[PDB]
Curated annotation (Swiss-Prot), chain B:
Residues of the full protein shown: 78 to 231 of 231
Function comment: Probably participates in efficiency of electron transfer from plastocyanin to P700 (or cytochrome c553 in algae and cyanobacteria). This plastocyanin-docking protein contributes to the specific association of plastocyanin to PSI.
UniProt entry tagged with the keyword Plastid: yes
Name of the protein in question: Photosystem I reaction center subunit III, chloroplastic
Record keywords, A-Z: Chloroplast, Photosynthesis, Photosystem I, Plastid, Thylakoid, Transit peptide
GO terms of molecular function: phosphoprotein binding
Alphabetical GO biological process terms: photosynthesis
Localisation: Plastid, Chloroplast thylakoid lumen
Swiss-Prot record, chain C:
Task of the protein: The light-harvesting complex (LHC) functions as a light receptor, it captures and delivers excitation energy to photosystems with which it is closely associated. May channel protons produced in the catalytic Mn center of water oxidation into the thylakoid lumen.
CC cofactor note: Binds at least 14 chlorophylls (8 Chl-a and 6 Chl-b) and carotenoids such as lutein and neoxanthin.
Domain notes for this protein: The N-terminus of the protein extends into the stroma where it is involved with adhesion of granal membranes and post-translational modifications; both are believed to mediate the distribution of excitation energy between photosystems I and II.
Organism per entry: Pisum sativum (Garden pea)
Record's protein name: Chlorophyll a-b binding protein P4, chloroplastic
UniProtKB/Swiss-Prot annotation, chain D:
Protein name in the entry: Photosystem I reaction center subunit IX
PANTHER family: PHOTOSYSTEM I REACTION CENTER SUBUNIT IX, PTHR36082
Transmembrane feature ranges: 7-27
Name of the gene encoding the protein in the UniProt record: psaJ
Species assigned in the record: Spinacia oleracea
Protein's GO biological process: photosynthesis
From Swiss-Prot, chain E:
Keyword 4Fe-4S: yes
One Gene Ontology MF term: oxidoreductase activity
Alphabetical list of NCBIfam families matching this protein: psaA (TIGR01335)
Pfam families: PsaA_PsaB
UniProt membrane topology term: Multi-pass membrane protein
Enzyme class: oxidoreductase
Gene: psaA
Protein name, as recorded: Photosystem I P700 chlorophyll a apoprotein A1
PROSITE patterns registered for this protein in UniProt: PHOTOSYSTEM_I_PSAAB (PS00419)
Catalytic reaction(s) noted: reduced [plastocyanin] + hnu + oxidized [2Fe-2S]-[ferredoxin] = oxidized [plastocyanin] + reduced [2Fe-2S]-[ferredoxin]
GO biological process: photosynthesis
Record: residues binding chlorophyll a': H655
Sites where the protein binds [4Fe-4S] cluster: C553, C562
Length: 176, 154, 166, 42, 730
């Protein structure tokens, strides 16, 4: 007769969303951008074709020393000051709560009209395409599936096999 | 070295164990997998107990008669980490089981009606008092015996 | 009803002795790096004096010294229960008498004090750690290695090595 | 969404997602080192 | 309770201490209520004082069994499929020795995985799929992989009918509280329309696809996935397309036939699983009945009818409250369902119904003891729940002066007899054996009770066995052999790997086990009978229906005043039955191997797994560990380092778990209290205990952790003892 589940943090799920998905922008346009036959060709000789490898797992370290830094700073002062103890304001804390952060300390604040209001108008823009980005990337992340599964010849694994017409992979279109 | 015999560097009886016993693992002249891709005695199960050759590491490891290896651990000749190395380890791990036992417990008996909060779990595992254990340098080895759990509370 | 901390004397003094001996410990290394060539364990002995006698032994050396360290150390004990060390610059620091806005109890966070001319045991704060954790570092990387930094020919780039032990 | 001074609850036997698993990841150390009886160190 | 309603929350009850009797789980903390909650979780003296729902729950929380038996089976069909051995075993039976399960070689594991047949590593089976599965008028591994998901289909759906009850706003009274038709339906067309339906898919498809399997081939060199439609042309080999008959009746001519069936009895030479040419006819000849039968009726009438003098006036009116009970119409059922399971246990071993059983020894005795513990574990229950009636179910006493009010009238009486019955037995039913010892260890055989010393003479024969295998000469039509090959007269030639069934002779050492059974079956029942009868009132306690059918014990007075009750008569009644079945098992295999199971070769000189050692040597009750327990079991205590090994390696635990029960069975209670505090003390010093008042076991919970253990202990012990002396020689 209907679930018991608006996770109160029904309020927070929605912000790894704008994380996950704005983000899939980075893959969506640079991919098919690629640049078909640019003129053309992909060749990267430079730091890479003679100094004994370049990356892989010095890759990650440097690579996400920064993502390191930044992803942390991201949610852990999104906002929330007050930042300790001890009775309920719910999210699972707002034990920042009624105090934002400081009683007349510094400029904790951005912007006049005693709040943080990045003004009133802009529902426009990112309500639409952006929680789009959530939606969008559902189905061209449902293409990740289509785009490659079938492990282009070079391997049948656990041999059912189980019929046979013709191949599959990616580049755009479809026989049909 | 001590009461039993010497390690792996030589242990005749132990050798015979390697060989008959396991290798009769053999015992199945064939049993069909001439090329076939499943029945895996064949590869390892032996070789994983086996390529464990005249090497097992080398461990010292005393080995008595029948050559099954015995554990002295008296902190000498070679054998020290057959109790202490995996001993302090047992200690450290436990005690950070119950350091937090005496924790997602001493954090409740207060506020408003706290009479079985524990059949559900407030922070799962405690996931707050969690690391208090690795975040034990010294810790109970002082603060247990001085203050808090202080003889007073004794 | 003793809410929370506490402690104090305690192991703030606990630290600085780590800090300032991790600092010294690394004077240990300092040597073999500029006009370089000589160290690791090098299980010293340790700098060794004259050509008039020792001779592998002449004695447990090492063993003794720290019988001495020993009653000098009861001495710092011989301080911290009941404050006694003229300078007085560790137990809270010098600037004679003071800091002990934590000697009689009641801390919570208490930052501290102590140089007359002038500033503090502070940016001797963080040389304080740089070196403790450094050791952590230092006798971290032995257990496979023992030397730093040439140029851009073929050194600083990590070429091929060999697991942990396993 | 979870800050400082204890959090949200959990069921009767989440121990069955604690015996099974965690502990489960340990067979996962008992095949990486498919064997023990002393142990090398790091 | 709120939270708060009635009517005027959807907001569900997650949070606020308790529920279940009203100075409930109280604010104040405790542990006992955590075995409470699970125990008596299903019950009905609480939930509501008003029938209504309960039947609306049990028709749902039921459901989730079928669905489950349905998630189960699937992982068995799947399992009996891609974790193959079935494909390999079927082209190659008599030869293989089946598997479905296999480990994964983590830690010690692998020893458990030891070459089983069509060329692979695994752990064996004593659960006769691979043999229902003979059926497959089709064969194929991925196919069972459809029958498999076909299983998960029935489930999710036959599990959303359980949403589509209680949680959905439910039916009510009339629906079940008009019973008028129920069996009408059930038996008619399912009992009927299955057996019937099963007929149609038991000659259509199966018969033919093992009519020409009992020879050779390799499957798909036979039985396509559709092949068996309109094509009534291969049905040509296994009788006419009726030729000139039209819908049975008689203006029919047979100058040479009589449809499929052509009744058998005996055993296929090449697959002695009893003939299938019959198996259609018998299921057909069932259904009809059910098809005709489930057509009674609408109910009192028939029972409101035949009374007499001493008979049952209340026979007439034998329960309005049999539309208003459950605990009653469950207890009745369990006696039947239960007692109608272990009747399987025989007609199976003395008349196999699947291809390749008997030759398969271990893959149909496992059976005959699994089916055997249910036709027992469901019977003591079938008493428990009557005690649950006898105590409470109805509202008041509206039930009066009848068959029962009658039986109770005598009660220090029906059980007055039955008692002496048992000590007459026991003396004639066990010390009988003890004679032998005391006098064969004294040693003078002249005077034992041997199949040969006390007067009986080289024959048993003349009774009824010998007028069963010989009866195809009565009103009997016939059909070579009998009905069950194990009967006195004629025939031998049964099977070409090992053996199957043959006469099975008797006299003494068959005479007196058969009697220990009596005394065992009887004193079991004494304790349940007197237990459920004296359910509510007595002359040790009359104020004795005042809580429930459990209650620990009334109190130190009256002398004892402890066991009484009827939870506990259904606690010491299990304690026996564990024997009742546990010694019936002990019977069958020592027979079935001492004789029967054994083996042919030239001149078919029979060579039983044991040249009849039984003979003069079960009669001694030491011979029962000379010849049994110490003889066989040498395979359990040799079993290390092997493939089955998990049995010997259980056989120590569970031969431990039992020897842990006694601790729970044999002990006080304020004891582990008195102890639990010493503990609780040391606890408080470090500051580590009080919250949720730790407490000892609930007098009768303690008994609950006896018994249950004493059984899962004392039982699996043999579950191991067995599978370890039929796998490998036998
Ligand atoms: C958090 C835990 C906790 C702690 C610190 C202790 C500590 C102690 N127990 Mg103990 N105990 C516990 C839980 C605990 N127990 C539980 C749950 C039981 C089951 C009823 C017992 C049953 C028990 C008995 C019978 C005895 C002790 C005794 C003792 C003392 C001797 C230590 C010993 O050898 O037993 C080893 C510890 C056990 C056998 C306990 C097993 C349970 C552990 C694994 C709890 C683990 C944490 C648990 C999952 C909590 C959830 C975490 C939460 C923060 C989310 C010591 C003071 C002995 C004593 O009185 O002498 C001083 C006595 O023999 N205990
Ligand atoms: C997704 C759905 C769902 C939800 C949210 C609920 C919620 C509820 N149901 Mg419910 N129910 C459901 C599906 C659901 N049901 C289904 C599918 C069925 C039929 C199969 C039922 C049959 C049912 C009945 C008869 C009753 C309820 C009741 C209730 C209420 C009490 C629930 C409770 O705490 O039981 C806790 C129990 C569980 C969460 C598990 C359910 C047990 C089954 C279905 C699966 C477990 C068996 C499993 C194999 C365990 C044994 C093996 C083990 C070794 C692992 C609550 C509002 C009760 C009520 O109205 O209040 C008195 C009432 O008794 N339900
Ligand atoms: C068709 C029947 C069936 C049904 C539907 C019921 C239904 C019921 N019985 Mg019941 N019963 C049955 C057959 C049945 N019984 C049989 C055959 C017996 C004889 C053994 C009994 C003996 C019996 C008793 C003595 C009682 C009931 C009670 C009840 C009621 C309580 C149910 C409950 O809370 O779960 C109880 C189940 C548990 C608490 C789960 C514990 C199960 C443990 C013991 C595990 C079993 C061992 C197993 C090997 C362990 C799993 C593997 C492990 C090693 C990993 C309920 C109405 C009780 C009542 O008070 O009536 C209102 C009363 O206690 N029954
Ligand atoms: C705690 C006590 C102490 C101990 C250690 C034992 C131990 C034992 N007693 Mg014992 N006993 C005791 C006190 C004790 N008793 C007392 C005080 C009495 C009363 C006087 C008895 C009366 C008694 C009797 C009458 C019997 C025993 C027996 C036994 C033995 C069973 C064989 C065995 O376990 O092989 C050891 C090997 C294993 C346990 C291998 C286990 C591997 C399997 C189970 C899998 C691994 C475990 C896994 C968790 C299980 C799967 C469960 C899963 C679903 C979670 C065992 C050695 C029995 C016996 O065998 O001969 C006398 C006999 O029945 N005892
Ligand atoms: C450099 C950093 C590293 C670190 C420290 C973090 C840290 C974080 N990431 Mg993150 N992330 C990383 C690499 C990292 N990420 C990478 C390489 C990717 C993929 C390219 C992501 C993709 C990602 C997504 C989609 C999200 C996060 C989110 C988060 C936040 C919650 C993470 C979480 O799962 O809770 C840990 C809790 C557990 C129970 C485990 C947290 C600040 C989420 C967030 O921002 O929430 C507001 C969500 O948006 N991350
Ligand atoms: C005045 C002198 C000088 C000073 C500044 C100190 C200072 C100190 N001594 Mg000490 N000591 C001294 C002379 C001195 N000592 C001499 C001459 C002896 C010869 C026995 C000692 C023997 C001694 C011992 C055994 C110890 C100290 C300890 C200490 C330290 C703890 C304070 C204490 O124990 O007082 C004592 C406080 C009292 C109230 C004394 C009680 C008086 C009787 C009547 C009761 C402290 C830094 C302790 C220490 O640091 O241990 C690691 C302890 O070890 N001293
Ligand atoms: C074959 C077994 C079986 C089946 C079909 C059921 C079925 C049921 N049990 Mg149940 N139970 C069982 C074994 C079983 N139990 C055992 C072994 C125990 C241990 C004592 C219990 C202890 C128990 C309790 C305490 C409760 C139930 C309840 C229920 C009912 C609640 C269904 C629901 O709320 O949502 C269904 C929910 C899901 C399908 C969610 C998924 C959950 C996992 C487990 C899958 C349902 C009738 C509840 C009740 O009173 O209803 C009668 C009650 O809460 N059971
Ligand atoms: C009646 C049975 C029930 C039982 C006791 C088992 C038991 C088992 N299944 Mg299983 N299974 C079942 C129902 C069951 N299954 C059903 C209904 C399905 C269909 C969804 C499956 C589909 C399945 C697969 C695909 C696998 C198993 C596997 C296994 C084994 C792996 C152990 C495990 O599950 O956790 C760990 C184990 C013997 C695994 C196996 O056989 O490999 C050794 C394999 O992973 N099962
Ligand atoms: C209830 C049962 C079950 C089911 C679903 C079917 C179904 C079918 N049978 Mg059938 N059959 C059954 C039991 C069943 N049979 C049994 C037990 C026997 C032996 C006594 C037969 C002997 C039989 C014969 C000889 C034939 C069929 C044929 C058929 C097919 C069409 C004619 C028909 O019987 O019904 C539908 C009714 C009409 C078309 C009128 C149909 C697929 C025929 C066929 O192959 O297709 C035409 C025909 O060959 N059956
Ligand atoms: C031994 C014995 C006890 C003592 C038995 C006890 C106390 C068993 C209860 C022990 C429980 C099951 C331990 C539960 C603790 C854990 C579930 C908590 C930690 C959670 C896990 C992660 C370990 C009785 O209470 C008793 C009562 C009546 C008749 C006979 C006996 C009897 O024989």
């Amino acid at each position: 007769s209907d679930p018991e589940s608006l996770r109160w943090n029904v309020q927070a799920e929605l912000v790894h969303s704008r994380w996950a998905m704005l983000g899939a922008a980075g893959i969506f346009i640079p991919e098919f951008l690629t640049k078909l036959g640019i003129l053309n060709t992909p060749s990267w000789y430079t730091a890479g074709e003679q100094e004994y490898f370049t990356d892989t797992t010095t890759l990650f370290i440097v690579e996400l020393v920064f993502i390191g830094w930044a992803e942390g700073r991201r949610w852990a002062d999104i906002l929330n000051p007050g930042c300790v103890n001890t009775d309920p304001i719910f999210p699972n804390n707002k034990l920042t709560g009624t105090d934002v952060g400081y009683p007349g300390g510094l400029w904790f604040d951005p912007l006049g009209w005693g709040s943080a209001s990045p003004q009133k108008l802009k529902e426009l823009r990112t309500k639409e395409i952006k929680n789009g980005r959530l939606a969008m990337l559902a189905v061209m992340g449902a293409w990740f599936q289509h785009i490659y599964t079938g492990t282009g010849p070079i391997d049948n694994l656990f041999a059912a096999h189980l019929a046979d017409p013709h191949a599959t992979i990616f580049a755009a279109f479809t026989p049909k | 070295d001590i009461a039993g015999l010497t390690p792996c560097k030589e242990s005749k009886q132990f050798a015979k164990r390697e060989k008959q016993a396991l290798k009769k693992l053999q015992a199945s002249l064939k049993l069909y997998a001439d090329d076939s891709a499943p029945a895996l005695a064949i590869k390892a199960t032996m070789e994983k107990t086996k390529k464990r050759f005249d090497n097992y590491g080398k461990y010292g490891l005393l080995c008595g008669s029948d050559g099954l290896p015995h554990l002295i651990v008296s902190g000498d000749q070679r054998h020290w980490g057959e109790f202490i190395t995996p001993g302090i380890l047992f200690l450290y791990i436990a005690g950070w089981i119950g350091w937090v036992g005496r924790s997602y417990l001493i954090a409740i008996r207060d506020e408003k009606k706290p009479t079985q909060k524990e059949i559900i779990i407030d922070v799962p595992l405690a996931s707050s008092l969690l690391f208090r254990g690795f975040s034990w340098p010294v810790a109970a080895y002082r603060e247990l015996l001085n203050g808090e759990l202080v003889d007073n509370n004794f | 009803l003793a809410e929370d901390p506490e402690n104090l004397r305690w192991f703030v003094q606990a630290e600085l002795v780590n800090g300032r001996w991790a600092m010294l410990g690394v004077a240990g290394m300092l040597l073999p790096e500029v006009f370089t060539s000589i160290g690791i364990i090098n299980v010293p002995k340790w700098y060794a004096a004259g050509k008039e006698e020792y001779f592998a032994s002449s004695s447990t050396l090492f063993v003794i010294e720290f019988i001495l360290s020993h009653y000098v150390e009861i001495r710092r004990w011989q301080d911290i229960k009941n404050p006694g060390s003229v300078n007085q610059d560790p137990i809270f620091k010098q600037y004679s008498l003071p800091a002990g806005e934590v000697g009689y109890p009641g801390g919570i966070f208490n930052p501290l004090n102590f140089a007359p001319t002038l500033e503090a045991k502070e940016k001797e704060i963080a040389n304080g750690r740089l070196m403790l954790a450094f050791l952590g570092f230092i006798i971290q990387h032995n257990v496979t290695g023992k030397g730093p930094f040439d140029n851009l020919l073929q050194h600083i780039s990590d070429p091929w090595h060999n697991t942990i032990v396993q | 969404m979870r800050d400082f001074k204890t959090y949200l609850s959990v069921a009767p036997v989440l121990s069955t997602l604690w015996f099974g698993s965690l502990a489960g990841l340990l067979i996962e150390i008992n095949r990486f080192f498919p064997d023990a009886l002393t142990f090398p160190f790091f | 309770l709120v939270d708060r309603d009635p009517i005027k929350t959807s907001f569900e009850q997650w949070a606020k201490p308790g529920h279940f009797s009203r100075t409930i789980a109280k604010g104040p903390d405790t542990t006992t209520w955590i075995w409470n909650l699970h125990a008596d979780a299903h019950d009905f003296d609480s939930h509501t004082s008003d029938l209504e729902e309960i039947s609306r729950k049990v028709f749902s929380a039921h459901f989730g069994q079928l669905s489950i038996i349905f998630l189960w089976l699937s992982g068995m069909y799947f399992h009996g499929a891609r974790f193959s051995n079935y494909e390999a075993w079927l082209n190659d039976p008599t030869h293989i020795g089946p598997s479905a399960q296999v480990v994964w070689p983590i830690v010690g594991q692998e020893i458990l995985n030891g070459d089983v047949g069509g060329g692979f590593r695994g752990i064996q089976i004593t659960s006769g799929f691979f043999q229902i599965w003979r059926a497959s008028g089709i064969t194929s591994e991925l196919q069972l992989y459809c029958t498999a998901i076909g299983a998960l289909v029935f489930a999710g759906l036959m599990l959303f009918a359980g949403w589509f009850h209680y949680h959905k706003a439910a039916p009510k009274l009339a629906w079940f509280q008009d019973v008028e038709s129920m069996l009408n339906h059930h038996l008619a067309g399912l009992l009927g329309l299955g057996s019937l339906s099963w007929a149609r898919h038991q000659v259509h498809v199966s018969l033919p696809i093992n009519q020409f399997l009992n020879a050779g081939v390799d499957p798909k060199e036979i039985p396509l996935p559709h092949e068996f439609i309109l094509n009534r042309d291969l049905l040509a080999q296994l009788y006419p397309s009726f030729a000139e008959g039209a819908t049975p009746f008689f203006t029919l001519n047979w100058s040479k036939y009589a449809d499929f069936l052509t009744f058998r009895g005996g055993l296929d030479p090449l697959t002695g699983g009893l003939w299938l040419t019959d198996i259609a006819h018998h299921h057909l000849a069932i259904a009809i009945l059910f098809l005709i039968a489930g057509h009674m009726y609408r109910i009192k009438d028939i029972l409101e009818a035949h009374k007499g003098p001493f008979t049952g006036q209340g026979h007439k009116g034998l329960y309005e409250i049999l539309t208003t009970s459950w605990h009653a119409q469950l207890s009745i059922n369990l006696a039947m369902l239960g007692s109608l399971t272990i009747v399987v246990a025989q007609h199976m071993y003395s008349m196999p119904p699947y291809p390749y059983l008997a030759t398969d020894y271990a893959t149909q005795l496992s059976l005959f003891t699994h089916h055997m513990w249910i036709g027992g574990f469901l019977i003591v229950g079938a008493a428990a729940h009557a005690a649950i009636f006898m105590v409470r179910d109805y509202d008041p006493t509206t039930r009066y002066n009848d068959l029962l009010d009658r039986v109770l009238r005598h009660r220090d009486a029906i059980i007055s007899h039955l008692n002496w019955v048992c000590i007459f037995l026991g003396f004639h039913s066990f010390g009988l054996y003890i004679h032998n010892d005391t006098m064969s260890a004294l040693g003078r055989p002249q005077d034992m009770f041997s199949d040969t010393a006390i007067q009986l003479q080289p024959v048993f024969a003349q009774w009824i066995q010998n007028t069963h295998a010989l009866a195809p000469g009565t009103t009997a039509p016939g059909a070579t052999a009998s009905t069950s090959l194990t009967w006195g007269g004629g025939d031998l030639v049964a099977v070409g790997n090992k053996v199957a069934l043959l006469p099975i002779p008797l006299g003494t050492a068959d005479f007196l086990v058969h009697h220990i059974h009596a005394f065992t079956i009887h004193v079991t029942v004494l304790i349940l009978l007197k237990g459920v009868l004296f359910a509510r009132s007595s002359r040790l306690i009359p104020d004795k229906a005042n809580l429930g059918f459990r209650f620990p014990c009334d109190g130190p007075g009256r002398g004892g005043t402890c066991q009484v009750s009827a939870w506990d008569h259904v606690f010491l009644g299990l304690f026996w039955m564990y024997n009742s079945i546990s010694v019936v098992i002990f019977h069958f295999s020592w027979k079935m191997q001492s004789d029967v199971w054994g083996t042919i070769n030239d001149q078919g000189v029979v060579t039983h797994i044991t040249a009849g050692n039984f003979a003069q040597s079960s009669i001694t009750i030491n011979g029962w560990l000379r010849d049994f327990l110490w003889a066989q079991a040498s395979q359990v205590i040799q079993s290390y380092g092997s493939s089955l090994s998990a049995y010997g390696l259980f056989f120590l635990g569970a031969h431990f778990v039992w020897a842990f029960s006694l601790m729970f069975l044999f002990s006080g209670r304020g004891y582990w209290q008195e102890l639990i505090e010493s503990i609780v003390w040391a606890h408080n010093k470090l500051k580590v205990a009080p919250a949720t008042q730790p407490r000892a076991l609930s007098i009768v919970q303690g008994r609950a952790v006896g018994v249950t253990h004493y059984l899962l202990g004392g039982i699996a012990t043999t579950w191991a003892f067995f599978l370890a002396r039929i796998i490998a020689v036998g």
